[PDB]
Amino acid sequence: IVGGTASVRGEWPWQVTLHTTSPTQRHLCGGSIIGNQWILTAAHCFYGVESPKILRVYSGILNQSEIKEDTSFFGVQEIIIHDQYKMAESGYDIALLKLETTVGYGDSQRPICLPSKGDRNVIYTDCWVTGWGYRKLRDKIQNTLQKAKIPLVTNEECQKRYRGHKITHKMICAGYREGGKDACKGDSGGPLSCKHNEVWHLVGITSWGEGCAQRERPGVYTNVVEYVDWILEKTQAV
Numbered sequence: 492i493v494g495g496t497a498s499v500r501g502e503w504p505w506q507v508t509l510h511t512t513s514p515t516q517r518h519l520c521g522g523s524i525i526g527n528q529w530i531l532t533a534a535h536c537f538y539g540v541e542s543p544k545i546l547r548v549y550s551g552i553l554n555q556s557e558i559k560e561d562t563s564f565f566g567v568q569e570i571i572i573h574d575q576y577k578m579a580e581s582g583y584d585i586a587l588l589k590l591e592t593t594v595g596y597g598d599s600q601r602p603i604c605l606p607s608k609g610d611r612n613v614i615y616t617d618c619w620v621t622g623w624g625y626r627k628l629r630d631k632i633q634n635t636l637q638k639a640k641i642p643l644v645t646n647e648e649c650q651k652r653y654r655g656h657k658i659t660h661k662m663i664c665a666g667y668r669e670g671g672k673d674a675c676k677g678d679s680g681g682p683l684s685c686k687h688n689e690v691w692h693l694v695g696i697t698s699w700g701e702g703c704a705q706r707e708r709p710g711v712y713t714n715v716v717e718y719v720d721w722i723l724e725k726t727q728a729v
């Protein structure tokens with residue numbers, strides 16, 4: 492996160508750190524708890540991930556230093572990538588992780604609400620991007636979970652900023668016209684959380700952008716509202 496601030500423990504209880512174990516264990520992507528066995532994240536995180544066996548999901552983490560060999564995690568039983576996904580820049584950058592065990596909910600870990608299909612027309616004024624990603628392009632994974640309040644950008648305005656790309660209504664953009672606050676390397680897969688009527692909603696999934704928090708280069712997020720039926724299809728299968 493560029494131009495971010497240290498989060499308070501339990502500020503974002505749906506935020507998870509997804510680690511890979513190959514060749515060595517390290518943070519790979521962010522993710523969000525959406526159900527007691529479900530993590531919503533980005534499809535691009537799994538490039539070259541041959542097996543769910545190398546994945547570890549940690550919930551209730553503020554600091555990466557809380558993670559050692561003795562720290563408990565959730566194993567991933569299945570990786571479900573949208574089958575229209577080719578690349579982040581083309582959309583469908585969404586994936587589900589089915590966990591091997593059930594997440595117990597508490598003040599340290601709980602799910603975020605998906606946005607309502609009825610609320611597809613509402614305007615979110617209190618949106619935050621979170622993660623352990625870089626503070627600038629040439630940086631490193633941060634110990635403490637960072638947060639940044641960023642305004643949503645219209646599709647029309649986002650499309651002007653990305654000449655050469657096709658910004659669809661399945662994408663949602665965010666960032667200040669002047670830059671300075673946004674996602675960066677290692678934040679992808681994480682949530683773009685918006686508070687509406689005292690309830691936090693998973694409005695987006697950190698996906699892609701040209702550089703980190705550059706002037707007139709807003710962050711591009713998977714527009715979760717457009718995938719609620721796909722999420723329900725995969726998580727409520729009979």
Ligand SMILES: CCOC(=O)[C@H]1CCCN(C(=O)c2cccc3c2CCN(C(=O)/C=C/c2cc(Cl)ccc2-n2cnnn2)[C@@H]3C(=O)Nc2ccc(C(=O)O)cc2)C1
Pocket residue numbers: 517518519520535536537538624631632673674675676677678679697698699700701702703704709710711712
């Ligand atoms: C950054 C875009 O890069 C690419 O598309 C290529 C180069 C990187 C690998 N590529 C992937 O597709 C790929 C595969 C797997 C994971 C990732 C990528 C690339 C995208 N990504 C981001 O987080 C996206 C940030 C991002 C998001 C928004 Cl909304 C706006 C601007 C952003 N950035 C623009 N430039 N940087 N960020 C991941 C990453 O790089 N994670 C990461 C990085 C470093 C370490 C570490 O431990 O140091 C650990 C995790 C291809």
